[PDB]
Amino acid sequence: PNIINFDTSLPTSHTYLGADMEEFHGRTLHDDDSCQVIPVLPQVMMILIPGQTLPLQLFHPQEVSMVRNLIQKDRTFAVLAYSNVQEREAQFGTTAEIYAYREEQDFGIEIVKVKAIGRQRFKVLELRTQSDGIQQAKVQILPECVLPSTMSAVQLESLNKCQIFPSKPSYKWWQKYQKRKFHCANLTSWPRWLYSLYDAETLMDRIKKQLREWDENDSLPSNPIDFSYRVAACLPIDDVLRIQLLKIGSAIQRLRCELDIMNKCTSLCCKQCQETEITTKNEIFSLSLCGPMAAYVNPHGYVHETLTVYKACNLNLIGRPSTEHSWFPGYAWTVAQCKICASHIGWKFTATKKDMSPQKFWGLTRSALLPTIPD
Template sequence: MSDSDDNANNLPDGQMENGHVPMEVEPNNSAERQSGSARSHDQFDIDLPTSHRYLGKLDNVSGCAFYDDGEITTLAAIQTNTLVFPGFTLPLVLNNDLEINMLQRHTQKKNAFVLLTPTKDFKSVFAYGVIMEIFETHLRNDVLYLKARSRQRCQLVPGKEIKTLVGELYQVTVKVMLEPPITSPISNTQLNSLKLRARFKCTDYREFNKYRKYRQYHLCQYPLATWVYDKHEMCFLRDKLIQGLTSYYLIEFIPHDPVQLSFWFVQNFQLKHEERLKIMKIRTAIERLRLELRYLNMKRLICCAKCEAEIAQQNNVFPMSKDGVQSNYCNPGGYVYETVTVSKATNFTLIGPPSAQFSWFPGYSWTIMQCKMCSSHLGWQFTSANLKPDKFYGLAKNGFDVKIVTEAA
């Protein structure tokens, strides 16, 4: 959302506007609540932001876009400044007739496109992206609203031209990247006599410890201590990362599947752009988790991208969406904002009155936030008179930078 967000889309009569029911058609059970300061406060439903109901009613798209590992394919591509990892959703609003017609033509047979992101200096296109599957779309008043889900990572094929179709729409040739099977780093060196007894795909580190003596029999032939090899096991890395993340997030929000966890970490822990790009191109979950453990041990601050004034701390972030603390949202002008929700913020001023139009969080009104020091756009303050929390902040990823205060030991 930006200064242009007051130009919200006009929905047909009877539909929900901006994700919440207008006051004149509010259901009776809501009208019966007590008014004023005595009104009850309901906990906000974190399932609502992921539905992106501010886009209005969309039509389901059938079919599934899935490619084999290593498959090379040519698809339409859209470039944004956001990153979307497998399993997460991207909303889009297209206002350009030429872009709409071109995208519809390219996705008619394959309901998928490639999402491109810039390099760390924001001057060119990063060599890795994700294949997005369109699952909901609707053309209304010459504006195309759609939602796409990230399915697979991919790599631009070297030597193949990035062809500009129209505006921000391109055509690219990519090679699909799939997750390799999770195995123990010592599974191929195990003695045949121990293969029936030792287990290498333990999902829990406590279960893994039950088979420690069999590992010791095998690892005694190598020069390093057993714990050195333990640190390269998937269950060890996963449990260590989850243990560290519980300092910032409730454990029920943290996935336990190692692949999902490696992607969830990028969407929730505050990383620098170059750190996120580095994780994007790492092929295996075990390598990603090892690098993420290192990033987890670095103390970080959220600062203004222009003047470096402190805005929030890592422990201020909290989830207002079931996807986590960081999600992508789109304004009526078609600009996609990667937004981080925090409970506390500092060094900002509010611009203009609160507005409920096109609100990404149904039931909340937003007010534009600017940096108190340099007046650059930071994000939005969200407030509600009848929801909990009654106030929080959505920081735009392009408005702040992550400052590393102390490096990992």
């Protein structure tokens, strides 16, 4: 399979939203381990990851007035990772900062279209709801654990000059990298190969090997913090596994967990059925620059984290293909339900031009899928 006649930068632009929006570039970050009070959007159910974009459409006057006054301040709201969605129970969350905004007042109907981005993880202290229905959370800022090298303590001063290794053009290169980077492992109780399992650079390379299978077309971050978050936003896992990935403080533990999920979880089944295989990791492909899965908003303000796959099975197609509000310009969508339990699993996308490639793909919503370890 190959991507021909499709601009992979289009889905990342969120063109279905409308005309060019006012942009904001002034970032705002809070001191690590501080208690701030941030407003919560009521209808938002999604679990946000730092560096991830959240597209929104707000029609309610309490939602609209909230964002209107939010733009005049730090442009930041709280996105809660609800453990219990029906009981509104949430223990953690991510701050989302608005970077693009557009207000519509045509026909006297007020609509607010925003593009926000995940910034900081936090722990919930209390959730008090205000008169306008809008909640305000008491939030304790979770910190990002930056860790030095495992050898940064034991490494002898004489073997310090061997820390920087020459350019990487290759198993022989990685064999040499391990022996030089972890040379002072002999001063401790563990082997160099053990230290490799906690080395951010090696772990990122192992993940890059499987991320290259999904996107066969080097546009990933260098910082292990930013890389682990980019990988987390792509992994189509259950809400419980996502809240655990979001709980992790270190990039190394995050990268390790992501590798475990990528090796172990290779099958995607219907969450309601658990008796219907929708697709496998072999079909996952990145039709966007962000990866094989991104959040998009529907015409009613409902956010769907859509995973793009080449082939999907055991799905029934209901309705006729429509290009209205299409998240992949040039494709038409058709609702696809599980053939067993009729659950809305996602949509089949169909090219409108014969010169396009792929001619057909599937966008599956994360909330409808469940990763299963096959045996």
